[PDB]
Every structure is written in structure tokens, then in C-alpha cells.
Design an enzyme around this catalytic site. Sequence first.
Site, PDB file in Angstrom:
ATOM      1  N   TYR A 142      33.366 -70.462  14.784  1.00 50.34           N
ATOM      2  CA  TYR A 142      32.502 -70.079  13.668  1.00 50.34           C
ATOM      3  C   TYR A 142      31.886 -71.339  13.050  1.00 50.34           C
ATOM      4  O   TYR A 142      30.675 -71.405  12.809  1.00 50.34           O
ATOM      5  CB  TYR A 142      33.337 -69.324  12.620  1.00 50.34           C
ATOM      6  CG  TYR A 142      32.610 -68.927  11.347  1.00 50.34           C
ATOM      7  CD1 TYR A 142      31.605 -67.952  11.357  1.00 50.34           C
ATOM      8  CD2 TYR A 142      32.955 -69.498  10.116  1.00 50.34           C
ATOM      9  CE1 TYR A 142      30.956 -67.554  10.164  1.00 50.34           C
ATOM     10  CE2 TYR A 142      32.320 -69.109   8.929  1.00 50.34           C
ATOM     11  CZ  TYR A 142      31.319 -68.137   8.957  1.00 50.34           C
ATOM     12  OH  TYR A 142      30.666 -67.773   7.783  1.00 50.34           O
TER      13      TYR A 142
ATOM     14  N   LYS B 234      27.857 -72.570  12.642  1.00 47.74           N
ATOM     15  CA  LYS B 234      27.315 -72.870  11.312  1.00 47.74           C
ATOM     16  C   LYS B 234      26.747 -74.293  11.227  1.00 47.74           C
ATOM     17  O   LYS B 234      25.668 -74.511  10.670  1.00 47.74           O
ATOM     18  CB  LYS B 234      28.388 -72.664  10.233  1.00 47.74           C
ATOM     19  CG  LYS B 234      28.745 -71.224   9.965  1.00 47.74           C
ATOM     20  CD  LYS B 234      27.517 -70.477   9.468  1.00 47.74           C
ATOM     21  CE  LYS B 234      27.797 -69.025   9.149  1.00 47.74           C
ATOM     22  NZ  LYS B 234      26.684 -68.455   8.335  1.00 47.74           N
TER      23      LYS B 234
ATOM     24  N   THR C  13      31.942 -72.603  -1.346  1.00 43.92           N
ATOM     25  CA  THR C  13      33.393 -72.707  -1.281  1.00 43.92           C
ATOM     26  C   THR C  13      33.887 -71.253  -1.047  1.00 43.92           C
ATOM     27  O   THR C  13      33.095 -70.415  -0.610  1.00 43.92           O
ATOM     28  CB  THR C  13      33.955 -73.298  -2.613  1.00 43.92           C
ATOM     29  OG1 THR C  13      35.376 -73.447  -2.527  1.00 43.92           O
ATOM     30  CG2 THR C  13      33.591 -72.428  -3.807  1.00 43.92           C
TER      31      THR C  13
ATOM     32  N   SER D 158      29.185 -72.420   5.096  1.00 43.94           N
ATOM     33  CA  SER D 158      30.522 -72.110   4.596  1.00 43.94           C
ATOM     34  C   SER D 158      31.337 -73.404   4.452  1.00 43.94           C
ATOM     35  O   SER D 158      30.947 -74.449   4.984  1.00 43.94           O
ATOM     36  CB  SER D 158      31.202 -71.156   5.583  1.00 43.94           C
ATOM     37  OG  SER D 158      32.481 -70.796   5.122  1.00 43.94           O
ATOM     38  N   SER D 159      32.454 -73.362   3.726  1.00 46.36           N
ATOM     39  CA  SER D 159      33.262 -74.571   3.565  1.00 46.36           C
ATOM     40  C   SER D 159      34.258 -74.789   4.719  1.00 46.36           C
ATOM     41  O   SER D 159      34.875 -75.852   4.811  1.00 46.36           O
ATOM     42  CB  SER D 159      33.987 -74.571   2.227  1.00 46.36           C
ATOM     43  OG  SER D 159      34.920 -73.515   2.166  1.00 46.36           O
ATOM     44  N   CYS D 160      34.430 -73.765   5.566  1.00 42.89           N
ATOM     45  CA  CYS D 160      35.327 -73.819   6.739  1.00 42.89           C
ATOM     46  C   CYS D 160      34.826 -74.872   7.713  1.00 42.89           C
ATOM     47  O   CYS D 160      35.524 -75.285   8.629  1.00 42.89           O
ATOM     48  CB  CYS D 160      35.311 -72.480   7.486  1.00 42.89           C
ATOM     49  SG  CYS D 160      35.644 -71.054   6.474  1.00 42.89           S
TER      50      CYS D 160
ATOM     51  N   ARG E 123      20.506 -53.300  10.003  1.00 43.24           N
ATOM     52  CA  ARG E 123      20.862 -53.674  11.373  1.00 43.24           C
ATOM     53  C   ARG E 123      20.258 -52.662  12.344  1.00 43.24           C
ATOM     54  O   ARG E 123      19.871 -53.005  13.485  1.00 43.24           O
ATOM     55  CB  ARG E 123      22.377 -53.712  11.557  1.00 43.24           C
ATOM     56  CG  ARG E 123      22.755 -53.961  13.017  1.00 43.24           C
ATOM     57  CD  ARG E 123      24.219 -53.614  13.273  1.00 43.24           C
ATOM     58  NE  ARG E 123      25.122 -54.579  12.641  1.00 43.24           N
ATOM     59  CZ  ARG E 123      25.682 -55.609  13.286  1.00 43.24           C
ATOM     60  NH1 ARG E 123      25.416 -55.815  14.583  1.00 43.24           N
ATOM     61  NH2 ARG E 123      26.580 -56.379  12.674  1.00 43.24           N
TER      62      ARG E 123
ATOM     63  N   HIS F 145      41.534 -62.987   3.389  1.00 41.16           N
ATOM     64  CA  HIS F 145      41.084 -63.761   2.224  1.00 41.16           C
ATOM     65  C   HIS F 145      41.935 -63.406   1.027  1.00 41.16           C
ATOM     66  O   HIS F 145      42.094 -62.232   0.672  1.00 41.16           O
ATOM     67  CB  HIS F 145      39.592 -63.579   1.951  1.00 41.16           C
ATOM     68  CG  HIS F 145      38.722 -64.153   3.027  1.00 41.16           C
ATOM     69  ND1 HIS F 145      37.675 -63.454   3.594  1.00 41.16           N
ATOM     70  CD2 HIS F 145      38.800 -65.327   3.701  1.00 41.16           C
ATOM     71  CE1 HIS F 145      37.155 -64.169   4.578  1.00 41.16           C
ATOM     72  NE2 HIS F 145      37.820 -65.309   4.664  1.00 41.16           N
TER      73      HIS F 145
HETATM   74  N1  LIG Z   1      32.630 -63.892   3.155  1.00 31.33           N
HETATM   75  C1  LIG Z   1      33.045 -65.013   2.501  1.00 31.33           C
HETATM   76  O1  LIG Z   1      34.304 -65.084   2.230  1.00 31.33           O
HETATM   77  C2  LIG Z   1      32.066 -66.093   2.129  1.00 31.33           C
HETATM   78  C3  LIG Z   1      30.917 -66.261   2.984  1.00 31.33           C
HETATM   79  N2  LIG Z   1      30.295 -67.521   3.016  1.00 31.33           N
HETATM   80  C4  LIG Z   1      28.963 -67.580   3.660  1.00 31.33           C
HETATM   81  O2  LIG Z   1      28.222 -66.369   3.421  1.00 31.33           O
HETATM   82  C5  LIG Z   1      27.687 -65.863   4.679  1.00 31.33           C
HETATM   83  C6  LIG Z   1      27.615 -64.331   4.565  1.00 31.33           C
HETATM   84  O3  LIG Z   1      28.977 -63.832   4.370  1.00 31.33           O
HETATM   85  P1  LIG Z   1      29.277 -62.362   3.752  1.00 31.33           P
HETATM   86  O4  LIG Z   1      28.097 -61.859   2.906  1.00 31.33           O
HETATM   87  O5  LIG Z   1      30.647 -62.365   3.064  1.00 31.33           O
HETATM   88  O6  LIG Z   1      29.413 -61.330   5.008  1.00 31.33           O
HETATM   89  P2  LIG Z   1      28.998 -59.809   5.349  1.00 31.33           P
HETATM   90  O7  LIG Z   1      29.566 -59.424   6.689  1.00 31.33           O
HETATM   91  O8  LIG Z   1      29.245 -58.900   4.191  1.00 31.33           O
HETATM   92  O9  LIG Z   1      27.384 -60.085   5.596  1.00 31.33           O
HETATM   93  C7  LIG Z   1      26.809 -60.170   6.920  1.00 31.33           C
HETATM   94  C8  LIG Z   1      25.655 -59.204   6.935  1.00 31.33           C
HETATM   95  O10 LIG Z   1      24.843 -59.529   8.083  1.00 31.33           O
HETATM   96  C9  LIG Z   1      24.520 -58.311   8.767  1.00 31.33           C
HETATM   97  N3  LIG Z   1      24.381 -58.543  10.239  1.00 31.33           N
HETATM   98  C10 LIG Z   1      25.283 -59.163  11.114  1.00 31.33           C
HETATM   99  N4  LIG Z   1      24.850 -59.179  12.355  1.00 31.33           N
HETATM  100  C11 LIG Z   1      23.600 -58.539  12.308  1.00 31.33           C
HETATM  101  C12 LIG Z   1      22.648 -58.240  13.313  1.00 31.33           C
HETATM  102  N5  LIG Z   1      22.857 -58.571  14.582  1.00 31.33           N
HETATM  103  N6  LIG Z   1      21.497 -57.590  12.943  1.00 31.33           N
HETATM  104  C13 LIG Z   1      21.302 -57.251  11.648  1.00 31.33           C
HETATM  105  N7  LIG Z   1      22.141 -57.487  10.639  1.00 31.33           N
HETATM  106  C14 LIG Z   1      23.294 -58.146  11.042  1.00 31.33           C
HETATM  107  C15 LIG Z   1      25.704 -57.433   8.483  1.00 31.33           C
HETATM  108  O11 LIG Z   1      25.308 -56.062   8.592  1.00 31.33           O
HETATM  109  P3  LIG Z   1      26.321 -54.896   9.130  1.00 31.33           P
HETATM  110  O12 LIG Z   1      27.594 -55.054   8.313  1.00 31.33           O
HETATM  111  O13 LIG Z   1      25.490 -53.657   8.851  1.00 31.33           O
HETATM  112  O14 LIG Z   1      26.535 -55.207  10.606  1.00 31.33           O
HETATM  113  C16 LIG Z   1      26.095 -57.774   7.095  1.00 31.33           C
HETATM  114  O15 LIG Z   1      25.414 -56.914   6.151  1.00 31.33           O
HETATM  115  C17 LIG Z   1      28.703 -66.332   5.728  1.00 31.33           C
HETATM  116  O16 LIG Z   1      28.166 -66.401   7.077  1.00 31.33           O
HETATM  117  C18 LIG Z   1      29.144 -67.697   5.226  1.00 31.33           C
HETATM  118  O17 LIG Z   1      28.314 -68.689   5.819  1.00 31.33           O
HETATM  119  C19 LIG Z   1      30.920 -68.634   2.472  1.00 31.33           C
HETATM  120  C20 LIG Z   1      32.184 -68.531   1.931  1.00 31.33           C
HETATM  121  C21 LIG Z   1      32.771 -67.318   1.876  1.00 31.33           C
END
Ligand SMILES: NC(=O)C1=CN([C@@H]2O[C@H](COP(=O)(O)OP(=O)(O)OC[C@H]3O[C@@H](n4cnc5c(N)ncnc54)[C@H](OP(=O)(O)O)[C@@H]3O)[C@@H](O)[C@H]2O)C=CC1
Lengths: 317, 317
Positions: free
Chosen positions: B134, B138, B162, B105-107, B34, B177
Amino acid sequence: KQRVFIAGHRGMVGSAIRRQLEQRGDVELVLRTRDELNLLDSRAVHDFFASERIDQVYLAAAKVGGIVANNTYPADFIYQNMMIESNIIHAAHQNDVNKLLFLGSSCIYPKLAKQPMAESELLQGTLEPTNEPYAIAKIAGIKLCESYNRQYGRDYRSVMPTNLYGPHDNFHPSNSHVIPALLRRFHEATAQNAPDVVVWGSGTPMREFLHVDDMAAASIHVMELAHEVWLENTQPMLSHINVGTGVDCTIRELAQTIAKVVGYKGRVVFDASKPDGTPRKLLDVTRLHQLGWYHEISLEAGLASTYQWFLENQDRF
Amino acid sequence: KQRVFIAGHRGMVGSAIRRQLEQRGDVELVLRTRDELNLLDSRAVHDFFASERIDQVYLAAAKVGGIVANNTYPADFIYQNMMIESNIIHAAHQNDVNKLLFLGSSCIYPKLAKQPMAESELLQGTLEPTNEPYAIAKIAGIKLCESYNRQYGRDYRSVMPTNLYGPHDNFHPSNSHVIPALLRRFHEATAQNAPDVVVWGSGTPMREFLHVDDMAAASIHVMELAHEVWLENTQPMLSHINVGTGVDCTIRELAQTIAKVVGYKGRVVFDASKPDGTPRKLLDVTRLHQLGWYHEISLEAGLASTYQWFLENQDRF
Ligand SMILES: NC(=O)C1=CN([C@@H]2O[C@H](COP(=O)(O)OP(=O)(O)OC[C@H]3O[C@@H](n4cnc5c(N)ncnc54)[C@H](OP(=O)(O)O)[C@@H]3O)[C@@H](O)[C@H]2O)C=CC1
Ligand SMILES: NC(=O)C1=CN([C@@H]2O[C@H](COP(=O)(O)OP(=O)(O)OC[C@H]3O[C@@H](n4cnc5c(N)ncnc54)[C@H](OP(=O)(O)O)[C@@H]3O)[C@@H](O)[C@H]2O)C=CC1
């Protein structure tokens, strides 16, 4: 004196709002052309909101088009509208603009919605394929507004207009919108003295139309209402207000009225071997009426004046 | 050798995809933190895509959170996700990246959808209030993909997971969660030797869970499938693919399994004076199975390994 920014002031809806606000000195207008300010450029938009002292924003800028355009350039329609909305709404908030009016559309409602369509019909079913990308961008625009209202305590309102018509509409032959398309065809059929004008379908489906000046009036009315009155007639997550006449008429009646307005003496013929669209499509304007606003321009009157405008500006199409 | 950009490679899902792609030399990874690349900045994103030679993009970057966050920062959730999606998808296209995988996502499915939820359940009814902003962002992401596919002939695919769990999940006490929240509570109840652990609700509702490593495997599988095979199993305007197990289990069974995995000897008590959520929520994974992919990690096994990870990394929460 309120400083108002009307985004897309050159467009059909934008210009109509401008015409009415220009007619009062308790407001000062801040306008920027596409060449002066590209709304897709995030930095440019923030810079503008940072340099100017904006009190209100009428978000009337959009990538708009007919049936052919929406199916031909879907990516441009969803992407551009999403960026323009995002940029303006976020920049406005970042620079303390508390008042904003977002202009949506009726294409946003589910294809098989219950008629007349109340505001709660939003997101209740699948969208019309042709309008899907545009519709999603617009719905996102409304939700952006509601989200900033909820999180930051902003006052970003939104209105959902029915089918619009009036001056500055797209009278080009490429436009699929029924009113400007029929005004043009009947105009030419009258000039070339054609014995008949054939229209696809049975002419039985019912549609609702609102003159653009009435649209602008309703918009300004909703924008200027007391916050408490607005909050009282809406919900935080169902905040948009339908803007229309609540009156529907058949395509047959529409074509026949245009023929009369234009002075066409031929025969209007409906070819029923071609399919119709949905049988009926109109907005439930209860919420708007309870807010004390009612339209003033009738169909015949609006078609007559619009035709008049088309005549003085035909060397543009 | 394919040059792959995994946006948000530090996140739960992003890192899981990274772990699996690192384990093969026919791929070269391009990663940016980031701090190295702000995905909200349009110019920075275009500059990056212009300087690097990207062949594939896994869009795993997002502003994610629990029940409290989604209702507390709605504007940040809709705005940031919309910008990140828009910036990446448009920049990718502008710089000739033809392959992209969007993680939804499933939401996103209607609150009162038919169970199990097939992909056609999308936009068939109102969304869960908590997830509305959200969810809209999506859905817009999916429609952006379909629109670029339609207009420009791109190959931007999307998967709908899911409920996920596994390493790098949010084990903080603030996370709502169920899996990471219960692992933490049972861990501490075991350590403090508490006689019982009370859970709100009757424990009868059924939920579906998928380990994050299985998620990453399915994603890479869908990304790498033959374009003709994918086109054959999807539709241009209904292109997303559900990713899950298709198996549901009660919250009671879930809590009881976690208790066992953690070695908790107390009593698991469900307080039925508190309301339950929807009775059942699971994805119809028919489309995914027909694409030849099946999950490998069972609940007990996944919970055991995840707990193991939590133990080696607890001094982070
Ligand atoms: N989390 C869940 O329970 C599950 C997720 N999903 C799907 O998976 C997707 C990812 O979720 P998940 O991996 O858990 O979430 P995380 O928050 O762990 O992953 C998001 C990542 O994106 C990075 N990021 C966000 N904004 C920026 C930015 N402006 N510039 C650069 N990097 C950025 C974050 O970095 P940093 O933290 O350094 O800001 C982080 O590493 C979700 O959007 C969803 O669609 C589906 C079901 C469930
Ligand atoms: N048109 C209709 O039939 C009705 C419209 N509505 C609502 O009204 C809204 C406005 O529609 P309408 O007035 O007819 O359309 P117009 O195309 O006439 O208005 C759009 C205006 O926005 C400007 N604009 C677009 N992109 C940019 C940009 N990147 N930077 C700066 N300016 C930009 C355009 O300028 P330029 O042309 O110079 O590019 C144009 O003047 C619609 O989005 C819809 O929600 C509702 C029902 C019907």
C-alpha cells in the site's frame, strides 16, 4: 515445449535474452513489436494474454534513458514504466501465467548505500535525484511481483542488474552511459587523429560493468532455477537478486582500456577541476553466486566484441 | 464557477471533502459512483475527463483496509492503488486539468523514523511489512505528481494525513483501526454491562489522531492556497504536506476517553503480557502550520460527535 513471451525483445536486454533462447528448441518464442502490441494499453495486453498460451514472461520492456532524459521527461519515465509493469504482471496472473522474470536496475539503490550493495540495501535511504521517478517505478515493479507471489502463489522473480553494455546499446551522442559514450568518443578521436581526449573528473571513482550477454545468461538461469531452490535463497519481501560481476574498476582504467581496444594513440586526460560522482558503486553478488552462476565475459573481451559490433552497425547512429 | 471532481466521494475522506464543498456555491461538483465510473479502467477515465470540463481534482479514491486486509490481499492493494492513481493523474493532464490534490497516508513513512516525522523522512528507511505494498503505491502517487509538476508545469499537490477517524469510517468488527474498533467494543461492553474490557498491550504507546472533518478542511486549504505560496513552502521533489494535530496521546488515555464518551462504567484493563507497537508515532506539522492552518476538533469533542454518528447509523454494521 515452453511458450515464452519476451516483452521488449528489440531492446538491448530483451534482444540478448532472445538471442540465447532462440538457440534452443525446447522453447517457442512469442514476440510482438510496439506496433503490434502497445504495452501501455491494458485491454490490448489482456487480449493478447487471453489469445496466446504463454508459459513464461521475461519483462524486458521499459522506458529507458540517460541523465538528460530522466531529468527532462520524469513524468513519462515514471508513468510509462508503472503502466507497462502493471499491465503485464496483472494480465499474466489473470491468464494463468505462473512464471515471470522482472528486470530492474541498480539505479534503484539508495544514493549513499553501503558498498558493495547487498539486496537488503533496497529502500534504506534516499534515491539519486536524477533517477528518482524511474527508480520508484522499478521498485513498484518488484513489489508487484512479491505481492502476487504472496497473495496468489505466483512465481514472479526479479533480477537487479549493474551497469550493462554490449550490442544494441545506445551509441548515439546523446547517451550519457559511460561505456557507449567513450567507445564513440575514442573511435572518433582515433579517426580524426586528435592529440588528446579530455574526460571530466579525476578518474578515481570505481564502477562495475557487466556485458549484456552475461546479463541474459544470468536472467535465464534465475528464471529456470527450481522454485524450492529460489525460495530457499530469497525472502518473500526481499526477493530480488543482484546480477553483476562483483568486481569494480576505476574510470581511469576503463577509459585506458577503451583507448587500447579502439587503437587510440593519443593521450587520455582527466580534468580534475570537474567533480566526481560517488567514489564507489558495485553490487554484492553473493546471493547470485550461491545460486551457482558466474559471469564469463571479462571487460577487455566484452569491450572488444562490442566495439566490433559498433563497427558493423555504425550507420545507425 | 469551479467544476470539482472528487474521486471516491462515498468514502470516509472523499465524503468529508464533499460535505464541505457542497456548502458553497462558487463550486460545482462532478461526482461518479464506482458503478458509473470504474477508476481502474483507463479508457473510461480518459473518456470521462474528455467529456466533462474539470477544473480541480481531489483524488480520494483508494483501496483501503486494516492489518488483516493489507496482509491478506497485498496484490490487490498495490495494483489497484497504482492503477487508480496513474489513470486519474495522467487523464487529468491529458485533458488540461492543472489542479489536483492527492491524498496519501502516514503509513508511508519508514517504520523506524525520527519522531515527530517531518516530510523529509520519506524514503529514509524500510517500511512496516504490513503496509509495504500500500505504502509503495502511495509513494508512487506522490512521485507521479512531482514528475508531472516538473515536466509539464502542472499543479498537482499532495497531503499526508495522520490516523483519521469520524463518520463513515469502517465500524465493522473486522476493522483493526483503534478508534472505530474501541468505540464499537466499549459500546457493546456498556450495553451488555460487562465488568471489564481487556485491551492488548501496556497502553503506554503514543499515537496522533485527526478528525476527518479537520482533514477535509486542511485539504481544501492546501488545494486553494496560492501557487506561489505553496512553491515557497515546498520543494519540487519533496512536495507533500503532513496533515495532523502534532499532539500525541497514549493508548491508555484514548481508551479511557472513549470509555467516558460512551458512558462505560466498567474497568478498562491493559494486558501487558502482549507486545506494544512502536513507542511513538506522530507527524511534524510545522510546514502545515506555517501555511496558516490549524485543526479545530479536539479528541474528546471528535469522539463524542463520531459516537453520535455511530448511534444513528449502527444498523449498517
Ligand atoms: N481510512 C483511514 O484510516 C485514513 C485514510 N487516509 C487516506 O485517505 C484515503 C481515502 O481513505 P478512506 O476515505 O478512509 O477510504 P474509503 O474506502 O472509505 O474510500 C475509498 C473510496 O474510493 C472508492 N473506489 C475504490 N476503488 C474504486 C474504483 N475502482 N472505481 C471507483 N471508485 C473506487 C470507494 O468506493 P466503493 O466503496 O463504492 O468501492 C470508496 O468510496 C486513503 O487512500 C489514505 O491515503 C489516511 C489516513 C487514514
Ligand atoms: N540500458 C541499460 O543501461 C541497462 C538496463 N537495465 C535494465 O534493463 C531494462 C531494459 O533496458 P534496455 O534493454 O537497455 O532498453 P531498450 O530501450 O533498448 O529496451 C526497451 C524495449 O521496450 C520496448 N517498449 C517500450 N515501451 C513499449 C510499449 N509501450 N509497447 C511495446 N514495447 C515497448 C522498446 O521498444 P521501442 O524501442 O520499439 O519503443 C524497447 O525495444 C531496463 O528497464 C532496466 O531495468 C539495467 C542496467 C542497465
